[PDB]
Symmetry: C7
Subunit: 256 residues, 7 copies
């Protein structure tokens, strides 16, 4: 049984191969990390060399025990293929992960809409991103889904814009409405005066004349500015004699 020495040689090749592979791959993503690339892309690109070198080792090692070479390429091919399928979704998500962290279309703490759902971003991880809905629900979105959909970011821009739509009665003084509204926004300090300040008759409506007011503020103020400016419009308009109309209807009577 002097051809049972190849069994021992097969092992030798595997152990030497496993080590030679482990040390090259370590010594490659030592190189990559020292350049800059990116921790994950390093580990990934690296772990391909690793699994590649032990793929060569398996071919030559089995090969000394008469395993036909072109059967190892085939079996390992299949093996790899079966893994490949099972993972993929992951691989795809893993990649989106990188992209998101290395392009920061949103960063942790920004409020964003990631395709129907919107919340404050907490953390982008390997496969999935975590946000917290204004009301306290937690949503976990797959990195893959995020990256191939639109990213609406409420917070990256420093100055944003409220739009009021106020409806008043048809017999209201057009000039009077404009003046009161203009004088409300003029006096509000939180409204940026060096930007758009549109007060205008916008829509001849169903039962109301509809005025549009659009004014810019710092992103932080936007919410409070809206509320404060509204309370105001309502108060002033009442004291000034302008009517917010209920729904109207001309009825045309007929005794029968």
């Amino acid at each position: 049984l002097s051809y049972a020495v190849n069994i021992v040689a097969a092992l030798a090749i595997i152990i030497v191969g496993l080590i030679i592979a482990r040390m090259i791959s370590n010594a490659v993503n030592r190189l990559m990390i020292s350049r800059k690339i990116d921790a994950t892309v390093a580990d990934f690109l690296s772990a391909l060399v690793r699994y590649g070198i032990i793929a060569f080792t398996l071919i030559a090692a089995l090969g000394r025990v008469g395993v036909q070479t072109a059967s190892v390429i085939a079996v390992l091919g299949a093996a790899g293929l079966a893994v490949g399928l099972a993972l993929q979704g992951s691989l795809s998500n893993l990649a989106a992960g990188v992209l998101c962290v290395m392009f920061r279309p949103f960063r942790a703490g920004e409020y964003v809409d990631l395709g129907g759902v919107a919340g404050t971003v907490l953390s982008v991880q390997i496969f999935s991103t975590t946000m917290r809905t204004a009301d306290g629900k937690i949503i976990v979105i797959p990195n893959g889904k995020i990256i191939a959909g639109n990213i609406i970011n409420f917070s990256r821009e420093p100055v944003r814009r409220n739009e009021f739509i106020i409806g008043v009665a048809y017999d209201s003084d057009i000039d009077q409405v404009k003046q009161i509204l203009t004088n409300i926004i003029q006096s509000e300090d939180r409204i940026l005066k060096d930007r758009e300040m549109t007060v205008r008759l916008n829509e001849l409506g169903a039962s109301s004349i509809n005025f549009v007011v659009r004014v810019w503020s710092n992103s932080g103020d936007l919410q409070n500015v809206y509320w404060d400016v509204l309370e105001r419009i309502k108060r002033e308009f009442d004291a000034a004699g302008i009517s917010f109309p209920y729904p109207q209807m001309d009825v045309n009577f007929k005794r029968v």
Copy 2:
């Protein structure tokens, strides 16, 4: 018939091969489990070595009965392919399974919305997850579907937020509404006072002035707090003289 000895040799290879395969594979996911990896990933990765080694055995064993080697790679290729298709959905679900249990974006007992349907999670299994709808229906969702869709988790966060929208009549005192609402929530102990406490005029409405109240509570209290605070608003508002308006209509008569 001295070339009918190869038939006997073919069997020998198969039995030795089946055993040698069965004991390597066992001896691999012995190693994996002892590290940490994950029971399932172990069994899976392992069972690939297993089926791989008996793939080699089949090649060499048939090969001694003149089965052309490159016809075994082909036949087994097809066989594997046919299985591959038939399973897949499963494989994909199996993988989602792992991910879900080893990332716990939801754990058993959390209430969650898994893409349109929502219930309390019971158990994540091989291919499919089981939840119980608040009313007692059981839903079985495929692990695969779950993982590639958004996961809304109502329960992982410890503190959550009710939003009331209360409509009052246009001739109601703005300041009075705010005070009563503010004094209701101020006194409710279950409302977390160190967080958001928004009471504000929010919408000039169709037939009602709409106030928005938003207050935070422990996740457990949220449901009862809502109901209790509502009963309250209704009672106080009535005793205080504030009217929840019916739908309005100005009618403008015309005899014809």
Copy 3:
């Protein structure tokens, strides 16, 4: 024509091959069935060995009539491929079949919603499942579709939950409504008293105060409990002086 003896040898190989194949495959799923596996998985896995072995036979048999070996792998490859396509849908459905019978996410006789359609399950067969809609229509759903969609099962759970929404007039006594409702459900024996018994003011509505009542019952009783508890609410509420309001409207007259 002494090279026309190979034609005779070709047949010999085919007949011996067909038989050798038929008897291994039989003798394999004899083994599988005797373990436990599953009748279909057996027949399937088995029928792959069968068609595999006669694939080898065809290669070697044609091969003795100078059919280039690597042309047989090719032709049979194509043949298999063409079949593969034509079936697949089937294969996919066949597999779903197994899963459904060997996981019983629904069993025959349970009422279920299988992605938009819902009915009482009759029988899960090879490719397709049969249910009967409450009203008598028969639906035939492909096993494949079922398994990759949500499965809502109305019947597996033994206790379920009705939700009534009752609207009463704004000027109705809040305490009185709660008491009558509570006293209706308290007295109904079919309502499980050791579970949720929610009677509460839920919605300040358009033209009605809306109370929500939620009570649990055995799955069998659920339908009759609802109807009986409703008839009751209506009767009691009338005799007690509480009004279910018609839609309301404040009209504000104007002679023109």
Copy 4:
């Protein structure tokens, strides 16, 4: 030009090959049809042997005119591939065809809903099924589409169920409504008395109390039973003093 004898030999192989192929294939689906299999599946499976054998013939025939063997596998591979694409839809439809005829989830003459469209089935053919809409439109649905969608079959079940929803005025006697309805259905012979006979107060409605009546009849009677039972309810209810209410509205006047 003694190497121009191979041209003549090439032809010989083709003619012999075409014939040998044509007579095996005939002689295979003679066998299949004599077992039972199915006329179409036979022709198909058969026609694969046919085109397979002439594929071998083409390889060896061209091969004697120095056409490199592994170029024929390649060219024919491409040819086949180009056909494959062009057909497929067909192939898929052809297969659905079989399944439909050999499982009769609907048979000719049954009224069915095949994914949004519904009509009386006329005939299932090679690729496409033909139904006639109740009103006389003809619809041609691809067999493929049919098989991968739900099949709703109105006609296979012998007994089916009407549901009436009747709305009466709030001040109507609950007991009186139940009795009249019950006495209508009790007397109707076409209503199967040994099955469900539900008459019940079902919905406290907008402007009507809504009763649900559900009764079973033979599939033939279902349409006429509905109409006849309706005419009846209307007549009896009127003569008995029960009012089908018009839409209601409480209006609350305000001089301004």
Copy 5:
């Protein structure tokens, strides 16, 4: 440079090959057309032989100028692949074309609904079908789209069916309505009397009792029969004292 004779031989092979290919292919679809097959299928199947034979020619011709054979299979493979992609949509449409013309699920001149759009068919061409919308728009639909979608054909059936829904006031005589309607349709000659003639009380409605009338006519008459029968119902109903009701409303006054 006596190895520069192969360049001349290469050309010879190409010219002879191009001609030998052009003349076989012509001589094949001469055969096909003389059987019956189908002008397009012939040209297609033929043009595959054509491009196949010149594929062999290119392999052997380049091969005498030392172009490694298995590089030609590769390059041409790619070339073909690139074409394949660019065309396909076409190929698919070309195939649908054939099917449509050789199954006439609609013929030129029939009015049909081809998945949302409907018009009178003009002409089915290579890739695309042309219809004319009742109002004069032209629509060009891809043959491929057509074939994989439902085909609704308004015109292939010779007799079709109108459905009138007529609403009359609740206090209208049920018997009188039925008689007038029945007597209208009885007298209309264009209504096929040997088929369905349904006049019945169908819906207890919002503000109207709704009668359904359904009557069959030749496909040509269907439009005019509807209009004529309608004008009629309106006239008769008026002269007979039956009221088509306006929308109703019971209003319940409240001085406040």
Copy 6:
């Protein structure tokens, strides 16, 4: 280093190869354009020969510097594949481009609906088509999208058809309405009198009797004819005493 002469020979082959390739390809689509084919199809088919011939050159050229032949097929295969993906969308659009220009289902200047969006076509280019919306927006649609969707062409047909729907009061004379409408359209010269001229009672409506008028005109006139015929109907109907009704309502009073 007399084996460093192959490096020089490698270059020679590449330069000769690049030229020989460049001059065949030029000399091929010289031929194609001189027949008729199509400028783009020529350049494309041509540019495949070009890149094909330099693919052969690269194989043999590298091959003289010991680059294993079957590694060049592989590397170039990958390279081509990576390009292939990156382009494709383009390739697909490029092909649609051709089809559109060489079938003119719409030509520049026609108004068309290309799947939801509609505008006047400006120019069809390589990948993308440009249209101008009636109001002045520019839309750029990918050629690929266009070709696989329906093409609605408003302009290719020379004569088109308006449909008026006019609602009059229930107590209006049916005959009078028809006559006035008929006499309006009879007198309008721009209405084609040799085509459809439908004036008819079409719908017994909610609060109006609805008449349908349908009349054909040249494509240019269609818009103006509609407007002019409308103004007319309104004027005549008023002067003739026919009422366009406001929405109706029978109210049924109840003191409470």
Copy 7:
């Protein structure tokens, strides 16, 4: 160990190969950039030569350490494949990037609708485009998504068109309405008088006669022209006695 010299030779090949690759590739996209092509397309096409040449180097280098050549094509094939998947989305986006910058269907600063979302474009980068919504949200859209969807460009066209729809009461003078509207737009300088100026009775409406006015202006003016022309219509119409009607209703009383 004189066969441990090949290890040293292996390294030599890699270093020489890496350099020879680095300097060809640099020297290729030196050439491309100097022509014109496109900075990105150059780097890409170039980086394929680069990775190709080191692919050859790896084959021959490993090959001198007995790594079977056809195992390197295989391993690297897999490696490449795994990368290929992980990237792709990127590759696709990268390509769309190019196309967008080198066709400028929108340029930075134009307002555009990119499939549902619309904003002012800021910058098109490698994979993703950034726009700013009128109100200050930032949207990040993948280049890939953009290129395969419609591109609506509000700004590339220099002159655009407002459409007013004004509703007046039925008893308003048709001629008077046309004149006032015509005289408003006639006098507005910002309205381009050499283009469309449509003032016309367009719709006989529910409770209003609806006039359509359509007038063209410079793209800059469009917004202000609309607002200014509206305020105007409202003012003039009031002073001139034309009534914008409230919703109408003929009510037909019935004492009960």
